[PDB]
Design a binder for these strands. Sequence first.
DNA 1: CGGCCGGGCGCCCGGCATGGCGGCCTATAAAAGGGC
DNA 2: GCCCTTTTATAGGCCGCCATGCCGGGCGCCCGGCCG
Lengths: 1306, 178
Amino acid sequence: ATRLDRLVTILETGSTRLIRDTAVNQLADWQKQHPEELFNLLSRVVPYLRHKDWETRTTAAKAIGKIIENAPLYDPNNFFRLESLDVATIVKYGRPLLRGGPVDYNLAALDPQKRLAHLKKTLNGRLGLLGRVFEDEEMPGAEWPFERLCEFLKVDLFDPQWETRHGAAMGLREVIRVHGAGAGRRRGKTRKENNDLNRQWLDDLAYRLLCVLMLDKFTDYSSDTSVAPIRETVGQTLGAVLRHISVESVHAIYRLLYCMVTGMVGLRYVVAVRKDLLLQDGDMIDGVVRCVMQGLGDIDDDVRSVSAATLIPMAKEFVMMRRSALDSLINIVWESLSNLGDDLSASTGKIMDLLATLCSFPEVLEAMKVSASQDEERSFTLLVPRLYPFLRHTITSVRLAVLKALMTFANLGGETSQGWLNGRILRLIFQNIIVERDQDTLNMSLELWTTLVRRLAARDPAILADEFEAHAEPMMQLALHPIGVPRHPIPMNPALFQKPVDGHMIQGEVDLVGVDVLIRSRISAAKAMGLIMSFIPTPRLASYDTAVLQALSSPYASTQLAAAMVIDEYAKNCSTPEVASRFIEPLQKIIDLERPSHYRDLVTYVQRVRSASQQLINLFRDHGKVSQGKLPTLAVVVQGEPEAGPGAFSIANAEKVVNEDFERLKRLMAPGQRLIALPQLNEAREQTVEVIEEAKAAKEARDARIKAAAACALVAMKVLPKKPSPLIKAIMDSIKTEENQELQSRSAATIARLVQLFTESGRRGPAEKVVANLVKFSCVEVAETPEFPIHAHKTNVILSMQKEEDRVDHPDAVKYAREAKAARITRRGAKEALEILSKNFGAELLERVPTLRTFMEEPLVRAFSGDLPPEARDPENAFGQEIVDAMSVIRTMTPTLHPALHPFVMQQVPLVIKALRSDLSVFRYMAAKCMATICSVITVDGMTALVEKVLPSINNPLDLSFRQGAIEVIYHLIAVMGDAILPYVIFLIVPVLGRMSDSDNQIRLIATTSFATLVKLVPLEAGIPDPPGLSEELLKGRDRERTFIAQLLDPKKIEPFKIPVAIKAELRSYQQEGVNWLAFLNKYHLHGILCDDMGLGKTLQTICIVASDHHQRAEEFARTGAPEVRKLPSLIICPPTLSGHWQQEIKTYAPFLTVTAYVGSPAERRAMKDSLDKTDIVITSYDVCRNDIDVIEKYNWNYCVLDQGHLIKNPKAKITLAVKRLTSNHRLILTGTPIQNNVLELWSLFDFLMPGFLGAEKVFLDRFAKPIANSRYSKASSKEQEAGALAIEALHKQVLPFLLRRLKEE
Amino acid sequence: SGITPTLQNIVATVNLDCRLDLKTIALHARNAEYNPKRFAAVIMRIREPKTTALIFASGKMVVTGAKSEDDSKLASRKYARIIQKLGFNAKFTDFKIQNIVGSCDIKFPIRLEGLASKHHNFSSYEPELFPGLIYRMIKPKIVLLIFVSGKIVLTGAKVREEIYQAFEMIYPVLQDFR
DNA sequence: CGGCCGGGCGCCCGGCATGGCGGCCTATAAAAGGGC
DNA sequence: GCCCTTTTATAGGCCGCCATGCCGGGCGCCCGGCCG
């Protein structure tokens, strides 16, 4: 078969969907190149529309779509007349279309044209044109180019083999959606005349479509609702066709519909694309309301799901021209909606939303009132509770719809809203709030509760308490429920939930979801109850006061935390904070008085400790041949159990046992048993230590968890302590160490309030302490503020890159990982704390509290703006860490700065830009990220500073300490700003690249990774917008970067470049193009792979480019004398047998190039140690290189080129190791194909091109390559395949621009 | 008292009360299968909850795959409504459940041999074809599959209490063998 | 200087050994109507 | 009356071939010796 057939059959046999997408893209590209291939392409792909697979038909249809999209509209210069359609021909004369039966071999064997004619006759039969339900035995460029294909597609619309329906519907859609306007036109009739012919053709199509839309009832009830396999596709196709249809034809089709409807989705698919005609004609918009009048009460739920989807765009101009239908619509909506006992409500949500957005208008209030004037049953006063039963439906989308619709009805206002504001909804919404898992529902519902309770309070908080009281106490008790741990839950008594799923919450099955989600469910009820608690009168609160007192005193651990946050909510809305004064002594005692002997919530941990200890205690002394009842044993009763005695077992008992019972056991089991039991005793001691430490850590953390919220409450009530040490230190410890993110989010606000409260009080002292600790904590994570005493000695080191090299070696023990996760949690809290404290003061931020400004400036301006004293640059000093600390603060605080504080950071800008060149890298690391942050946030000024001072000197060779930062800052910039650097490409891309071609260890690497991420970032399919708000002096018409980006993105944009040197062999056009790309690579210190077919004159292009660069270096040196073009020979690597070949080629094309071959007798190879520089070109076999690499590596070289580089692929071979040692100004890779169906091939090669461009094997294998290969296997998996292939194309994009592949035909 | 088993499948017998043209239905929708050359019943699945249906032309059906009685019933009713949608009338007349399947797990492995010897009159151990001990009991009539990893599967029950009882009866014998 | 040869090696590709994870088969429950 | 199908726990073996991991035969290439 042809290559085109292979490209087509991939659409069925493609291993991945993305490869088939590439196949259809290639087919469309071939169509673009060769429009004459359109019909062959269609006829080849069209047969797959009858294929069995869902995906294969979809792919063939999409192939047709892409192919026709790359084809022009047609222009030259029998039809079933539409009015013939009637109910009878479909309902009582037409053949039903259903599941395909056995193959019609008797007809399929005939010629396609004869078969088409026979199918046409049988189609005339099938439609009911004969007046009976007939039997098969009665019938046993001058014109539209797609006409025969269109006829086949239309005949395929009625195949019993239903796969043909699904495929051919999409195919005909792909024809008419793109070339609908041109369909049916023929020569003879002029354009104005054949417009009518096009109208008739599209009318015939609509006729057949309407015939299908009820003749075919094929169905799949597998899904509970969406039982439409092929009705929906043909309906959507009709919708696509409908946009071209003439208005009177739309009227006729609309008549056919609204008589047929009494295919219902056809009404939606015409409301999509002729909404204007419905309003303009006036009458035709009646059909959308009449359909819901007819259908919305039907028993069938298969069209109830559809009926809502038509109606959303309607009721805007309708309200003027057809006002009368509004009341009827809403009334029939509410009647159908109230069908309690029905099991689906999907369309109901959309209808509710449509009503809701209507309810924003006074006309809809009047619509309610006009119907309410006749009856109270349909009144807004009594109707709303029919929403109540829907609160706990299973599908979450309709839950969200319920919430938002309720909100809009709450927005209706008016005294009539009191009809359902009665306490029923007050209890029901809270019952929804308490246990709901889904975050979005919680988010909306808290707002809904707030608006509702505010509305009710607007009359009187007394009547609010009246509405709530009868349900109050059980609800509050539910709000004070405990919390537990996996496989030991605590459920809730369902008797407390009034009636109008949920089982995982009712049973308290914490195994399913993380406890943070449970705490979300708790804070939701907390915030819901807090507002009402504050609003209602204080004298009513006695029972509530007792409830919170119990929660404060209860042995259940969670209740103290819940109570503390509860009182925080209460205080934060109080008219005066002293109203909550009655909670001063409890919470302050919670933070002050010693935490309990036992935590009931932790009871399971205690039992686990007892069991895990006794299983050893009873083991070992019995293993010492001594078991007696009076010997030490842990008590049967465990403290915290229900009705447990005071003497019950506790963790302190375990501590008492393990302290001295181990040596007592050893002495007791002395005669022999100790020797044989000692290792078991060791692991037993380890196990006891593990479990005891676990329990103690849990208890301490829980103590902190209670105390943190307690301090939050105390701060909230504004009862500031006169001895602030415990409160502030508890706040700090909680902020540092809080495990739950929600409690951390609360504690951030706690401290952010506390600082302002201290500022009001005037006691700057404790404020200074807490803020100093806060900023001090920010340096904990090793990846954000490296330890000065650890890294201080390193010099001439690219310090930030150490994370790639050696930081992965640290995890040698659990002790390191523990502190690592602790650091992450600490910074997570710190960011929120600093963020909120930044925002709250805003423009006055540095003014309010000066000490933060002092910490932000003083070390940087005391150390820099000068030179470091000897102690400041002493690796064991006191001051050394301080500099990196302040720089950490600056690089953290920046993006939360208020705009008014911008002059401060711009005053800091002079310090860092000068400091960046410093000798001590430890400061350069902090400076790099800080500069990246300034550049990211205050865009214009940071960009100006960077481009105007940091960048322009980047090429100066003298100052190495500046040179390292000059690229390190660019790398951190690319990281921090991500793709947002893309508009700023016009100041970086070339000068940053130029760093690759300068010989300086570590510098070479960081540059390569920076350039690689840039290359990834540039779009493959988009241009560069103008940089936003940049001064003209910055830009100043720097189109060199634009040219570089253009040539990088497209080889065809590279300029021609003839040979400057006098090479005897002239370049042919393909040779010239290759030379053009090679020059473009040679023009910016890039390296790459050339992979031309050998028939194209392989060697000539390479030898031409190297000779050209040799001459250019010589002449530039004559003109400039610059070091950069220093004389070095070129070095070529090739097979030994090819050596001579190359030699002779050199003599032929370029006799001016002198040749030295590093070959001959071993003696002579030993003898030529220094002679090598005496000729322009050096010739080398792979293997003489592999031996004498110790020898050969002395001199640098101009060009290093691999002739047959395929041998180099191995990631470990001595040849690969050997070659890579060499250094030069240019290098290239010559191979037949770089990527020959294997991605693994490339890594080594690329490294050889660019150390540090793609990265090391530590990421190439683990991240991409291995999973790539795995997922690529057919037998592997089904899920990852598409993601795998997308990643494949990502690798192609990363590796394409520095590869040039050309076929010999080119 | 031993720990209760956990229920895992339900089989239901359901009465449609109408004669049906099976061949027609097969070609009517995608979600079914029926061939006398393969089997008598129409095999059909639905998703919500995941279930399989055997339907017989005389007007009865056997329904499978529910975890719970209420779930089972819901599934059955949905099936019946589906039937109603097909175009041939039917009703949810009768409902019966048999062989409710449950499972239990305990720590200790079970000495199959010893048990089998104890109840040799009632139990057989044949590790040459099935790595489990079939234990037969009368009151309630329950088939117990006893496995050597501490796992017992209970079958033939009508009600969960039956399996409960069965497990309660067997559990002391288990405790005798660890 | 010019050359053929036995002995030499790093390294690649083929046949092989092999095990993870997979259907299938036992128990095999219990409707049902059916084929034979 | 025996065998047919369905679904859920299940446990271990029976077999299967894919990727995996391997390393011996052989490749090309070098090269120390000795030939003329």
